[PDB]
Structures are given as structure tokens and as C-alpha cells.
Structure 1
């Protein structure tokens, strides 16, 4: 089972990944985790992150350029994701493809029905063959240049809610910060 944890920067996804992995292990499942972007592990991920801190000229000013770099990072991880899915009962991704749709749409002042989210679906799932997640979990809540942009994060949160409501990329579950990890594990993979 492939589970993606999604939400805006500062939502607390890493903590939820840690707590959810512990709940799955308490239920007897083997778990692997993988975080995107793969900073330190791929050139595309490193350049993209650096661009959001102001490096690399005009790169960050292009929404589709940034989205393309994050997609190329994920493309280099296809074999890794497939390997983890064959070897372990549950694979939890800290951020996945929906992050690219949410931030790209929000930067362009688009909604989940706009061109950017559809472009991400086409390039990442259809063209690059990224494994489709069984669950996308939105951690809904009330430093690089995205994180400093309060309006951007607010718009991204709204796009995320729309993506979940429209079933973008697969089945979604929406949870809050107070979600109980044990019950969530039971919902995602009933005993």
C-alpha cells in the first residue's frame, strides 16, 4: 500500500509520518518512508530547493519550470518507490505529486480544475509513470520563498482541499493535526 501525506509547509507532515509509521508497526506491518523533494539525493531536487532560496537566476519565477524540476526528481525515484512497495507492507511518502499540483495552481491563482493541476497529472502519472497512490492524506491546518509567502500558503491550502474533494490522482482522506494515528492506520489499512 502506497500512502502520500500532503499539506502546506508547516502543517506537521513529518510528525504525522513518524506517528503513522509507528502505528502501522504496532499493528504488525512493515513500513518504509520516502520524502520529496529528495534534497541531497538528486540534482533536480537540489536545484529546485536552491532556486526557492534565490539561487539560479530567474528559475524560480517560472511556475512550470519549478514543477518540472520536482517532477524530474520524482521520475528518478520510480524504481525506488516500486522497490519499497514490493518489499514492505506500507510505504508512506512525505509529500508527493499532489504537492506539485497544489503549489503550481496556487502560484498561478488557479483552482484544482485549472490547467496546472491537469498538466501535473499528465506529466507525472501518465508520461513519467509515477506510481499512483492508494491513499492521499491531506493534513489540513489553519525558510524558502514559498514558506515566507503567507498568501501563497493560504491559496495552496485551498487548492489542496479542492484536489481532495475532486479525487485528484486517487482516493483522498482529510485529517487534522489532532488525528489519532492508530485510528488513521486502521482506516487506511483495516485489519
Structure 2
């Protein structure tokens, strides 16, 4: 079973990953985790990071260019993902394909039913063959928390919620920070 944890930076994804991993293991499930982007391993991820810090000329200003780098990062990890899924009861990803849809649409001032989101779905799932998550869990935060570029983050949190409402790429759950971890594990892996 493949689960993706999603949300804006500072939402608290890492803590939720840990709480859920513990809840799963307490129920007898084995768990492996993997975080995107794979900063430090993926050349495409590290070029993207450098672009975010002002390197590589005009690279970061293209929305689709940055999205492509993150997709190439995941494509490089497809064998790892499949290996974990065969070897473990539950694989939890800290960010997956939906992160690309949310930030790309937000940067373009689009919504979840717009072009950017559909482009991501086509290129990452259909073309690159990345495995679809069984669950996408949105750790949803307020506009005030998201902004703390501030506007870009706020628009990303709104797209995320739209993606969850539309069932983009599969089933979603929407949770808050202080989620009941044993209840969530029972819901995700029934």
C-alpha cells in the first residue's frame, strides 16, 4: 500500500509521517518511508533547489521547467518505490506527485481543474509511469499558517484542498495537525 502525505511547507508533514509510521507498526504493519524531492541524491532535485536560491539564470522562473525537474526526480526513484512496496506492508511518501500539481497551479494562479494540474497528471502518471498512491493525506492548515513567497504558499494550500475535493489522482483524506494516529492507521489500512 502506497500513501502520500501532502501539504504546504511548515504544515507538519514530517511529524505526521512519524506518528503514522508508529501507529502502523503498533498494528503489526511494517513501514518504509521516502521523502521528495530527493535533495542530495537526485541531480534534478539539486538543480531545482539551486534554482530556488537564485542560481541557473532564468530557470526558476519557468513554472513548467521546475515541475519537470521534480518529475524527473521521482522518475529516477520508481524502482526504489516499487522495491519498498514489495518489501513493506506500507510505504509512506513525504510529498509525491500532488505536490507538483499544487505548487505549479498555484504559481500559475490556476485551480485544480486547470491546465497545470492536468499536465502533471498526464506526464507523471500516464507518461513516466509513476505508481498511483492508494491514499493521499492532506495535512490542511490555515491561510495564516500557510503564508507564515507568502501568497504563493497560501494559494498552494487552496489548490491542495481543491485537489482533495476532486479526488485528484485517487482517494484523499483531509486531516489536521493533531490527528488521532491509531484511528488514521485503521482508516488508511483497513
Q: TM-score, normalised by structure 2?
A: 0.96
Displacement of 1:143 in angstroms is 18
User: Is the contact between residue 2 and residue 90 of structure 1 (CA under 8 Å) also seen in structure 2?
Assistant: yes
Paired residues of 1:52 and 1:145 also in contact (CA < 8 A) = no
1:53 Cα deviation from its structure 2 partner: 1.4
Q: Tell me, which stretches of 5 or more residues in structure 1 are unaligned?
A: none
Matched-pair contact (CA < 8 Å) for 1:138–1:173: yes
- Distance in structure 1 (CA, Å) of the matches to 2:84 and 2:50: 28
Distance 1:16 1:178, change over 3 A: same
**d(CA) in 2 for partners of 1:12 and 1:178?**
10
Alignment CA distance shift 1:148-1:112 (3 Å): same
Residue in 1 aligned with 2:54? 54
**1:73-122 Cα shifts (integer Å, max 9, x gaps):** 00000001000000000000000000000000000000001100000000
- Say if 1:52 and 1:144, in contact at 8 Å, map to a contact too: no
Q: Is the contact made by 1:9 and 1:147 (CA closer than 8 Å) also made in structure 2? A: no
Q: Which runs of 4+ in 1 moved over 3 A?
A: 143-148
Give deviations 1:109-158, integer Å, cap 9, x for gaps.
00001100000000000000000000000000119999881100100000
1:44 to 1:85, Cα distance in 2 relative to 1, 3 A: same
Aligned to 1:45: 45
Partner residue of 1:68?
68
Q: What is the Cα-based RMSD across aligned positions, in Å? A: 2.5
Please name the residue that 1:24 is paired with: 24
Contact (CA 8 Å) 1:53, 1:145: kept in 2 or not?
A: no
Q: CA deviation at 1:55?
A: 1.3
CA separation of 1:79/1:144 partners in 2, compared to 1, >3 Å: closer, same or farther? farther
Structure 1 residues 148-189: Cα deviation after superposition (integer angstroms, max 9, x where no partner): 811001000000000000000000000000111111101001
Cα distance in 1 between the residues matched to 2:140 and 2:105: 17
Aligned pair count?
190
Distance change (3 Å), C-alpha of 1:24 and 1:146 = closer
Q: In 2, distance between residues paired with 1:66 and 1:144?
A: 26
Determine if contact 2:146/2:154 at 8 Å carries over to the other structure: no
Question: Does the CA contact (< 8 Å) of 2:146 and 2:157 recur in 1?
Answer: no
